[PDB]
């Protein structure tokens, strides 16, 4: 049988600055 | 070689759902950053800024994943296996709570101590039919010594401590202190 | 510089008077 | 540079009264 | 420049229990 | 026997910090 | 059969809020 | 005649710079020389030999200027001075750090998003604020990738990325945001 799926990928940088 | 730096954001006290960021620099370039709990098999990977520079992004914290972390580098050129000295561990707390203080007279004014077993704490102290909290002051050691004038001083308090900045943990409130008259 | 961010929640309260 | 924090918030309304 | 002025004041807390009898 | 599949693609980051004034 | 490669990283986050009127 | 010969590459033929990647030129009939194409120079390079037909070669840590258009040709001695194969399909390799960010739209009660850009075979990623994990995500073949969204629970705001369906993962940048009301 086709092993387990893998572990999710990490969390990406944080979004850019907000509006003014 | 020499030890990396390991820190916390926004705090290393936070209430479970938050959003904590570890960032480990290192005090000479490196390749990878290795973050290393102690029960774990392998460590798990930083993601790299720059060289001196990695993050370990932990998405929407729980109390188990608080515990011990440390930061070790590497160059693929120190060989495999080998990482740097580990960096001093950050010690993250995740909970929604904090454990209560006491509130006790200690050994004509009177002080109150307010004492928990955690640093770095704001201690406050309300009397009963005052809104308003009475005093506060941040603390590194884990406990504050409130002082009152003899003259106003008898009624009903009680206090807690909490953490200097949001996301705020606060202890549960203290049992209720009378100083009679 | 900004104004503060705003405080904490303040404790729960005293307990309640003994009733009958 | 931002103003501190505002002060820690009041304490809780007094209880409910106790039962019998 | 000047520090900005104090944040606003933390909401009240969760009335206390019940009393004693 | 044959791997698993890739996991899932990680989390979109931390949102921003807050704008200028 | 042993386990999938790990996902990939997210993306950059959401932007932040705005900055004081 | 003289049959191409095939092209491969690993671990990818989308990687970041840094990357080690082997080439692999098979032919169908056996051969002594295995000669790598790049427009630039005029002169050939060589391949490894295995084989008579198989041979490789290395392309040490990859830089982005180390990506293009290769073929592969194969020859032997008999053939007489200066005869190649018919070359080899082009094989595109394409060193990047980051891949062009795609644009996000809802097509012209359910609501479908389509997250495009330009390159062939990725996975693509839909994202939607406030929620953490990846909405949905589906390999393509096409530059794009059509989501669909319950219309009862479809207003809020979304972004998506693409990226390479295997280690060592090449990621896009993610698309502006899009607000459905
Ligand atoms: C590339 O290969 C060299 C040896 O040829 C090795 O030292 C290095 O670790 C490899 N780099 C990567 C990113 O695999
Ligand atoms: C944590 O970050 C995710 C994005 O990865 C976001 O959806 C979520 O709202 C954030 N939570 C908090 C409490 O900031
Ligand atoms: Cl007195
Ligand atoms: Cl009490
Ligand atoms: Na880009
Ligand atoms: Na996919």
Redesign the interface.
């Given at each position: 049988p086709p092993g387990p799926p893998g572990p999710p990928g990490?969390?990406?940088?944080?979004g850019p600055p907000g509006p003014p | 070689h020499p030890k990396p730096w390991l820190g916390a954001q926004p705090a290393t006290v936070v209430t479970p759902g938050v959003?904590v960021?570890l960032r480990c620099r290192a005090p000479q370039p490196a390749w990878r950053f290795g973050l290393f709990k102690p029960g774990e098999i392998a460590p798990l990977?930083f993601?790299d800024?720059s060289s001196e520079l990695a993050?370990?992004?932990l998405?929407?914290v729980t109390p188990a994943q608080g515990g011990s972390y440390r930061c070790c580098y590497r160059r693929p050129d120190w060989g495999p296996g080998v990482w740097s000295q580990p960096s001093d561990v950050l010690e993250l707390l995740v909970t929604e709570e904090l454990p209560r203080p006491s509130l006790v007279a200690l050994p004509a004014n009177v002080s109150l101590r307010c004492a928990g077993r955690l640093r770095n704490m704001?201690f406050?102290l309300?009397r009963?039919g005052v809104?308003?909290?009475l005093q506060?002051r941040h603390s590194a050691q884990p406990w504050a010594d409130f002082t009152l004038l003899g003259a106003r001083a008898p009624g009903?308090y009680?206090?807690?401590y909490?953490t200097?900045?949001?996301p705020?943990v606060?202890?549960?409130?203290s049992e209720?202190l009378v100083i009679a008259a």
């Open positions: 990490p969390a990406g940088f944080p | 959003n960021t990977l993601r800024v993050e370990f992004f998405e929407e704001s406050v309300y009963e809104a308003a909290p506060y009903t009680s206090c807690y909490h200097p900045s949001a705020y606060l202890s549960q409130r209720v």
